[PDB]
Design a protein around this ligand. Structure first.
Ligand SMILES: [Zn+2]
Lengths: 242, 123, 108, 95
RNA sequence: CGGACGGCUCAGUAACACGUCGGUAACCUACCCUCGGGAGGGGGAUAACCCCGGGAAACUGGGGCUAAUCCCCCAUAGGCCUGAGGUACUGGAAGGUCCUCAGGCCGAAAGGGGCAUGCCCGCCCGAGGAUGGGCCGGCGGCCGAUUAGGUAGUUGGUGGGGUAACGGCCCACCAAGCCGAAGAUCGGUACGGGCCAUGAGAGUGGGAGCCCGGAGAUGGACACUGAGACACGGGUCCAGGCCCUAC
C-alpha cells in the first residue's frame, strides 16, 4: 500500500502527447510540478535531447542547461524537469533559434520555428478572476500565472479573453475579446489544432459546460468546448501558426 | 567497596579513588542531590588533588553506575532497577528524531550493587 | 435563490437550512425523475425508477429497478404516488445524498 | 580503404563538429582506428588531437562500414565533455 | 534534505475493493510555477574536544568549554471565531471571495552563505495553480433453497461533540422504522481489470510473469516523529520460534 507521493514514471505509463520510444527503456523523466498540466506539457530534457538533437545523453543535456543557454518565456531555466507547454517560446541565442510549442492534429506537441520579433510576445487566456485585499483584481491565466489590475478597469477583462504580453517583463498589450467574429485556435479534443471564426455560443443547466460553433477557413462548420477555444485575433491571426 | 570520581569544576580535572568499610557504608540511603562532608569518608582533598583545598569542602553526589553496567536516573526513586520508556537522558542517547527505547536504569538511592559514584567538589 | 434548474419553486417558504430553496444546501451533479414508494420516515422519501438492461447472448432485455433515498423538505411535502424530481448533493445522513426539488404530478 | 563523408553538423553549444562518414573496404577486413583517424584529419584539416572516433560498425555483407566522429576546438572542453572510456579507447589518454 | 518512492508476494477481502461516468459550493498537500509583500531587537543550551571512567557484551554516567541555516523570547505583519452592515468578483447556483465597524484568541522569518566593487544559492507571509491524495454518488460485474425471514445504533429526526473535511463517525433526547421469492441473511470459493487460450462464428473457459489499482511484511494490537506512516532493511506489549552470555 503506497504511503506517500510518487517519484517515478514508467515509459508505458507516459502521456500520449509526447514523442517518446516506449519499449526502449523502462523509466521516463517524471515532470516536476509547474505552470502547465501533465497532459499538456513535456520536460526540457526531451526538447534538448530527442527533438532538436543538441545532445545524446542526459549528462550533456544537463550541462547545457546548467551553463545557462536555454530560455523559456525569456527566462533561464536550469531544471531538466521543468515542463514546457502550449504557446511557450523556446529560444537559443547562440544559434538565433526561436520555437513556439503547439499541438498537432493528433494531440502531440511540436516546435514551430518563428522570428526573433514574434518571439517577444506570448498570448495568455484568462481562466478566472478574483478580488484580492486592497480591492485589486487578480486574473488567473491558462499557464497557471497571475496578473494584477485595478478596480477601475475590471470590465475590460473577462474569463475567456486573451491578453498579449511582453514575456520577460510581463507588460500587457492588445487585449482580444471573445465575440461572434473572433478567430480561434483549438487546443484540445477531437478537433485539436483547427482554426476558424466563432459563430454561436450555447449555455446549459447545472454544471454542464458551454459549447461553441466555429467555421473553418473554407466553409465547414464544427463544434467544441468554449474552454478549448483560444482567441488569437479578431479577423486575422496575430502569431505565426502552422 | 566503592570507586569515587571526584571532579573539581574551577579547574576541570577529576581524580579516581576507592573507599571501603564504614567510610563506604556511610553512603547508603543517600539520594542524588545530597551533600556529605569529605571528613566523614577519610580523604585529604588537598593532598590527592595536589592543590590545597579549604575546610568544610563538602562534596555533592551527582550520579553513578552499578556492577552490571546500568546507570542511575535521578527521577526514579529507590535502589531498585526499573525498565522504562525514555525519550531523553540520562541513560539514553537518541539517534533519531522522536525515537523512544525501553531502557533499564537504577534509581536514586545508593546500594551495594553500585560500583562507581560521581562527586562534585562544592563550596 | 433561483437554482440552476428550470422548475417552478414552491408556493411555501421553509426555514430549514437543509433545503435548496430558502436554505444553504446546494445541488450539483445529476438530476433524475421517479415515483415515491414510501413516505413514513420524517423528512425522508424513497424513490424508484425503471430501466431496461440488454442481455447480449440471448439478444433480449430484462427490466430492473433502482431505489434511492432522498430528503423531503417541508415546503415540498411529497406523498406516495407522486412523480418527483430529485438532485444529487452532499451526504445528509447514512443513506441520503439526494434531495427532492420539485413535484411534477400529484396523486389521488 | 577509402572514405566518403556523408554528413556534417555543427554543435555550437558543446563546441564540436559531428561527422558521419562511410568506409569502403572491399576484400579487406575492418580498418583500424589509427588509419581512419590519420586519413580523416589529413583530409578535413583537423587537429589529430581534439578528434575522437566513436563506433566503427561493420554489417552483415557490405564491405562498407559506417563511422561517427567528434572534432572539438579546445582540448579542455573535450576532456570536460567526453567520458574517459572513449578517450582511453582512442589513445589520447592513459588508463 | 531524503529514507512514506523504487523493489517483493497474493494470505485476507463478494466490498464503492475494482471499472466507467460525474461531484467536493464538505477537505489536506514539503519539493515546483506566477504575482504581491517583508527579514527589526535580544538571549540560551549542548554534541564534537579535555580530565575521570563503569560494563562480558549490548550500551552508558560525571565535571569543564564552545558555534551555527540549532532552540527560545519581544515586536510588527498575518491566521481563526462571532455580530452588525455595503453589495464590488466568480459561477448554472454562494454557509465562498472583497469593503466598513466592533468584541476577542493564536501568532512569522536564516538579511543567512558565496563571488565581487551589484550577481548567484537560500528564509517568512498572502492569493492562485500544478503534483499527489482523502471523501460521495449513478451504472456494471461468481455458485448454493437439503440456506427463509433478518436488523436493535439497527432506520430516520432535533441538538451537539470530533475530524483536514460531509456523515450514527460518536453521544443525549424523540419516533418506529430499514432489507427481503425480481432471494435478503448465511455459507462456499476467490485479489480486480486491461488482457489470454480455443472455436467459422454465436460462445466456453482462465486471469502468476508486462501496465493500472488494492492489500500485506512471523500472528495480533497500540503509539512517537514528520507535508505525508500507525512505517518491508525505525518504536512498545502479548503469543509462537531461535541466537550470544563471564548467568
Ligand atoms: Zn422550503
Amino acid at each position: 500500500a503506497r504511503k506517500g507521493p510518487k517519484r517515478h514514471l514508467k515509459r508505458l505509463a507516459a502521456p500520449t502527447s509526447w514523442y517518446i520510444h516506449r519499449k526502449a527503456y523502462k523509466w521516463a523523466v517524471r515532470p516536476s510540478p509547474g505552470p502547465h498540466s501533465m497532459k499538456t506539457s513535456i520536460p526540457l530534457i526531451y526538447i534538448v535531447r530527442d527533438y532538436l538533437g543538441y545532445a545524446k545523453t542526459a549528462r550533456e543535456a544537463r550541462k547545457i542547461l546548467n551553463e545557462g543557454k536555454i530560455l523559456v518565456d525569456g527566462r533561464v531555466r536550469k531544471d531538466y524537469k521543468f515542463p514546457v507547454g502550449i504557446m511557450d517560446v523556446v529560444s537559443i541565442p547562440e544559434t538565433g533559434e526561436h520555437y513556439r510549442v503547439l499541438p498537432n492534429r493528433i494531440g502531440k506537441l511540436i516546435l514551430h520555428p518563428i522570428s526573433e520579433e514574434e518571439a517577444k510576445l506570448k498570448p495568455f487566456r484568462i481562466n478566472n478572476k478574483r478580488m484580492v485585499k486592497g480591492a485589486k483584481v487578480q486574473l488567473n491565466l491558462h499557464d497557471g500565472s497571475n496578473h494584477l489590475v485595478s478596480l477601475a478597469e475590471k470590465d475590460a477583462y473577462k474569463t475567456s479573453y486573451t491578453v498579449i504580453m511582453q514575456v520577460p517583463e510581463r507588460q500587457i498589450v492588445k487585449v482580444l475579446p471573445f465575440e461572434v467574429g473572433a478567430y480561434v485556435f483549438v487546443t484540445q479534443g477531437k478537433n485539436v489544432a483547427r482554426k476558424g471564426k466563432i459563430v454561436e455560443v450555447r449555455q446549459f443547466p447545472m454544471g454542464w459546460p458551454d459549447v461553441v460553433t466555429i467555421e473553418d477557413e473554407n466553409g465547414e462548420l464544427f463544434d467544441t468546448l468554449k474552454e478549448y477555444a483560444f482567441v488569437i485575433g479578431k479577423d486575422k491571426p496575430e502569431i505565426s501558426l502552422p | 567497596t566503592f570507586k569515587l570520581v571526584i571532579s573539581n569544576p574551577k579547574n576541570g580535572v577529576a581524580k579516581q579513588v576507592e573507599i571501603s568499610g564504614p567510610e563506604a557504608d556511610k553512603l547508603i540511603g543517600r539520594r542524588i542531590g545530597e551533600e556529605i562532608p569529605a571528613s566523614e569518608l577519610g580523604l585529604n582533598l588537598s593532598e590527592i588533588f595536589g592543590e590545597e583545598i579549604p575546610a568544610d569542602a563538602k562534596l555533592k553526589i551527582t550520579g553513578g553506575t552499578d556492577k552490571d553496567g546500568f546507570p542511575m536516573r535521578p527521577d526514579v526513586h529507590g535502589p531498585r532497577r526499573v525498565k522504562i520508556l525514555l525519550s531523553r537522558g540520562p541513560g539514553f542517547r537518541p539517534r533519531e528524531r522522536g525515537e523512544r527505547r525501553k531502557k533499564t536504569v537504577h534509581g536514586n538511592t545508593i546500594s551495594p550493587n553500585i560500583v562507581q559514584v560521581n562527586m562534585k567538589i562544592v563550596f | 435563490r433561483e437554482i440552476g434548474l428550470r422548475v417552478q419553486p414552491p408556493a411555501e417558504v421553509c426555514n430549514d437550512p437543509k433545503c435548496p430553496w430558502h436554505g444553504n444546501l446546494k445541488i450539483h451533479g445529476r438530476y433524475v425523475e421517479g415515483i415515491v414508494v414510501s413516505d413514513k420516515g420524517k423528512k425522508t422519501v424513497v424513490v424508484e425508477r425503471q430501466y431496461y438492461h440488454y442481455l447480449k447472448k440471448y439478444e433480449r432485455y430484462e427490466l430492473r429497478k433502482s431505489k434511492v433515498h432522498a430528503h423531503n423538505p417541508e415546503c415540498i411535502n411529497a406523498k406516495v404516488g407522486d412523480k418527483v424530481l430529485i438532485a444529487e448533493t452532499r451526504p445528509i445522513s447514512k443513506t441520503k445524498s439526494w434531495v427532492v426539488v420539485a413535484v411534477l404530478q400529484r396523486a389521488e | 580503404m577509402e572514405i566518403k563523408v556523408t554528413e556534417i553538423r555543427e554543435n555550437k553549444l558543446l563546441g564540436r563538429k559531428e561527422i558521419y562518414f562511410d568506409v569502403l573496404h572491399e576484400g579487406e577486413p575492418t580498418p583500424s582506428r589509427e588509419a581512419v583517424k590519420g586519413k580523416l584529419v589529413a583530409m578535413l584539416d583537423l587537429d589529430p588531437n581534439t578528434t575522437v572516433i566513436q563506433y566503427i560498425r561493420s554489417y552483415f555483407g557490405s564491405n562498407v562500414s559506417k563511422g561517427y566522429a567528434k572534432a572539438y576546438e579546445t582540448r579542455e572542453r573535450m576532456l570536460y565533455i567526453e567520458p574517459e572510456y572513449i578517450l582511453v579507447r582512442d589513445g589520447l589518454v592513459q588508463k
